[PDB]
Scaffold this active site. Sequence first.
Site, PDB file in Angstrom:
ATOM      1  CE  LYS A 110      29.545  31.213  25.396  1.00  0.00           C
ATOM      2  NZ  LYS A 110      30.835  31.842  26.176  1.00  0.00           N
TER       3      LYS A 110
ATOM      4  CG  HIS B 146      34.692  41.691  33.320  1.00  0.00           C
ATOM      5  ND1 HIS B 146      33.182  41.722  33.269  1.00  0.00           N
ATOM      6  CD2 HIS B 146      35.196  42.630  33.410  1.00  0.00           C
ATOM      7  CE1 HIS B 146      32.700  43.495  33.467  1.00  0.00           C
ATOM      8  NE2 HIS B 146      34.423  44.034  33.847  1.00  0.00           N
TER       9      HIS B 146
ATOM     10  CE1 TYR C 176      28.269  34.213  30.187  1.00  0.00           C
ATOM     11  CE2 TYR C 176      30.702  35.491  30.687  1.00  0.00           C
ATOM     12  CZ  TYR C 176      29.349  35.383  30.754  1.00  0.00           C
ATOM     13  OH  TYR C 176      28.905  36.525  30.319  1.00  0.00           O
TER      14      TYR C 176
ATOM     15  CE1 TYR D 148      26.239  37.596  33.026  1.00  0.00           C
ATOM     16  CE2 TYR D 148      23.330  36.986  31.758  1.00  0.00           C
ATOM     17  CZ  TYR D 148      25.232  37.108  31.364  1.00  0.00           C
ATOM     18  OH  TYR D 148      25.822  37.172  29.953  1.00  0.00           O
TER      19      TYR D 148
ATOM     20  N   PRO E  90      20.899  35.722  23.248  1.00  0.00           N
ATOM     21  CG  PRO E  90      20.232  37.999  22.754  1.00  0.00           C
ATOM     22  CD  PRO E  90      19.931  36.952  22.643  1.00  0.00           C
TER      23      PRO E  90
END
EC number: 1.14.13.2
Length: 391
Positions: A297, A72, A385, A201, A293
């Site tokens: 990580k 991604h 990220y 998200y 979550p």
Amino acid sequence: MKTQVAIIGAGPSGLLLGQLLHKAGIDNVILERQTPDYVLGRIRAGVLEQGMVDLLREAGVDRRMARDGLVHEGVEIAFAGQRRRIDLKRLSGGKTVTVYGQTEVTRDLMEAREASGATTVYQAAEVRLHDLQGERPYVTFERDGERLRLDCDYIAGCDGAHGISRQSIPAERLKVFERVYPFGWLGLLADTPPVSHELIYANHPRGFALCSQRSATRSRYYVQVPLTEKVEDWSDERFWTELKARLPAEVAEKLVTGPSLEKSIAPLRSFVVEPMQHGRLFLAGDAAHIVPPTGAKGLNLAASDVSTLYRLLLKAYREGRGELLERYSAICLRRIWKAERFSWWMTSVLHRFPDTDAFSQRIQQTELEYYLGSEAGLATIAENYVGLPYE
Ligand SMILES: Cc1cc2nc3c(=O)[nH]c(=O)nc-3n(C[C@H](O)[C@H](O)[C@H](O)COP(=O)(O)OP(=O)(O)OC[C@H]3O[C@@H](n4cnc5c(N)ncnc54)[C@H](O)[C@@H]3O)c2cc1C
């Protein structure tokens, strides 16, 4: 029986550490409380950092991942009627993340170990650690009904959040940092095609929602729920109705729903222990730290702990430089705290907290507006990220 490194736990951390060590010629035994089946039933992680991906390649277990994993290049955040895409690749300097289930990673590791002939003892009950500060530590466990003893040089505590290893360190030696959040995530795995080719998200007044995936025909969705909820109170249809209510209309419209393969509630919390070692015992993964979550990580930090431990164990065995092992905790904690800060931030800006005043709600909204509208702001999210570099 005797071995060089005794590994407590056959989750991702223990298996990956075991594989890396075996390949380098360092004998190790893995002791697991559960059965192979139970371990394989845990859904968990879906997002992997490039560092973890490279570590799987180094361990020689990346065939299926390279084939079935989805790379991604971006991820979306939806809030206040807006959908913002963070171009991870562009903003992080070329890095990306890979979507490949933790169940899959574990299965691949289990098969690799199985084939190598390395020792793994499932249903190892009543594991006890002894003489941690001696030259000869040992582990005792019960197989069937007989107490066996395993002598070794070092013990790697890879037994997760409820393991025995962290409990085996004198309480007065450890300093704990913990934060419990007032909500959990209700997750649902469905054999349906994902609503999007990238993760979404969403911050919505009703609460947080996340649209993730496992493949082109398997999806994983989450919705924030109070800790007082019972998974039995959430039918599939109630879940889908709630999910739809929290997503942008255009996204909710394209949603293909279906019966759940798995449903569960995971409470959110942050937890760190310092140091992460005691004598010849070294903690890795969830045994040493828990991250919410939100930032994806947990498994990824387990990977860097393991990479660090493996490399220090190699120097100790191959180069006779055992003194370097004293540096384990310092090295890991630097990365851990940074990932904890990121996961805490992500959690605070994406969820709806109970009893928050007008000022806090506006600041939460402005944090998103600022970070998703500034190039410097977007870059801070992106580099965190994809994963900060291993030291
Ligand atoms: C809902 C959810 C979503 C997540 N998403 C992500 C994601 O996208 N990306 C990410 O990086 N992380 C994610 N995580 C975190 C990730 O799943 C964990 O960090 C990872 O499972 C930790 O691996 P571990 O091997 O350290 O521990 P675990 O997976 O807990 O394995 C520990 C093992 O030790 C065994 N054990 C325990 N006690 C004993 C004992 N006494 N004797 C012997 N064996 C014992 C246990 O049975 C278990 O098999 C997520 C977690 C959750 C809950």
